[PDB]
Design an enzyme around this catalytic site. Sequence first.
Site, PDB file in Angstrom:
ATOM      1  N   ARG A 112       0.871  -1.159   0.000  1.00  0.00           N
ATOM      2  CA  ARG A 112       0.000   0.000   0.000  1.00  0.00           C
ATOM      3  C   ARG A 112       0.905   1.205   0.000  1.00  0.00           C
ATOM      4  NH1 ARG A 112      -3.003  -3.756  -1.096  1.00  0.00           N
ATOM      5  NH2 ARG A 112      -5.210  -3.724  -0.438  1.00  0.00           N
TER       6      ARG A 112
ATOM      7  N   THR B  72       4.180   0.858   2.548  1.00  0.00           N
ATOM      8  CA  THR B  72       4.148  -0.279   3.447  1.00  0.00           C
ATOM      9  C   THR B  72       3.745  -1.570   2.763  1.00  0.00           C
ATOM     10  OG1 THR B  72       3.243  -1.093   5.557  1.00  0.00           O
ATOM     11  CG2 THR B  72       1.702   0.055   4.151  1.00  0.00           C
TER      12      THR B  72
ATOM     13  N   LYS C 126       6.298  -1.212   7.501  1.00  0.00           N
ATOM     14  CA  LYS C 126       6.693  -0.071   6.697  1.00  0.00           C
ATOM     15  C   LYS C 126       7.882  -0.297   5.771  1.00  0.00           C
ATOM     16  CE  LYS C 126       3.396   1.878   8.991  1.00  0.00           C
ATOM     17  NZ  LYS C 126       2.443   1.114   9.806  1.00  0.00           N
TER      18      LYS C 126
ATOM     19  N   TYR D  90       0.516   7.573   9.460  1.00  0.00           N
ATOM     20  CA  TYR D  90      -0.009   6.303   8.997  1.00  0.00           C
ATOM     21  C   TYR D  90      -1.495   6.152   9.309  1.00  0.00           C
ATOM     22  CZ  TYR D  90      -1.234   1.392   9.036  1.00  0.00           C
ATOM     23  OH  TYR D  90      -1.893   0.207   8.840  1.00  0.00           O
TER      24      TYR D  90
END
Length: 212
Positions: free
Chosen positions: A33, A45, A94, A103
């Site tokens: 993502r 991540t 990450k 985040y």
Amino acid sequence: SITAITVENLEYPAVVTSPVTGKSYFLGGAGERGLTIEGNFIKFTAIGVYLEDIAVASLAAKWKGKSSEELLETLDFYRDIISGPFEKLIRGSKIRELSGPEYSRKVMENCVAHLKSVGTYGDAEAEAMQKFAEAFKPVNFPPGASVFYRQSPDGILGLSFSPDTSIPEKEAALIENKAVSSAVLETMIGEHAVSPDLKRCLAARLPALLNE
Ligand SMILES: O=C1C[C@@H](c2ccc(O)cc2)Oc2cc(O)cc(O)c21
């Protein structure tokens, strides 16, 4: 034949055991993502979704014998995975450094959109999302650092943070709210989750398990 998956050098073991519940899970799928900046996908991540071992027996009835191609195009399949009577463990590791607030901002945004979308975003859910936010504020995620979402079928979302990819022994917080408990996973493999990498892994990996 349930293999491990490596995303940007971040490995996701084929199986893992929760130090919190003692339950064991198998890797349902892993992907990445990030953000699309100027038409460019910027990875932030890695994400892996683990399903409790018992998920197989639960999903077998309705989805054994189905082909990966068939599962992939069936929303109901993913609904059973998301809201199935078994624990799901999601590990985000990450690739690029993100603070807890940074985040969580995007995750919460998507969770809130989903919740409002399906008409289940009341005061309780808002408070749960604030508690969600609070849990991330004192955390930073340098590369390799991880967040663990333990989605209990009992309507609780356990939050754990690690300096690396190892599962922490204790959870940092418990978000006790049914709607919110599945919101995170929903934004990853639900109908309105655009990214198909996790969905594709699940469709490709499950058939073998469901058959035996
Ligand atoms: O794993 C991630 C990445 C996260 C994120 C990406 C880029 C960024 O700059 C900050 C946060 O957004 C998300 C949002 C979700 O609903 C579910 C997710 O799994 C994720």
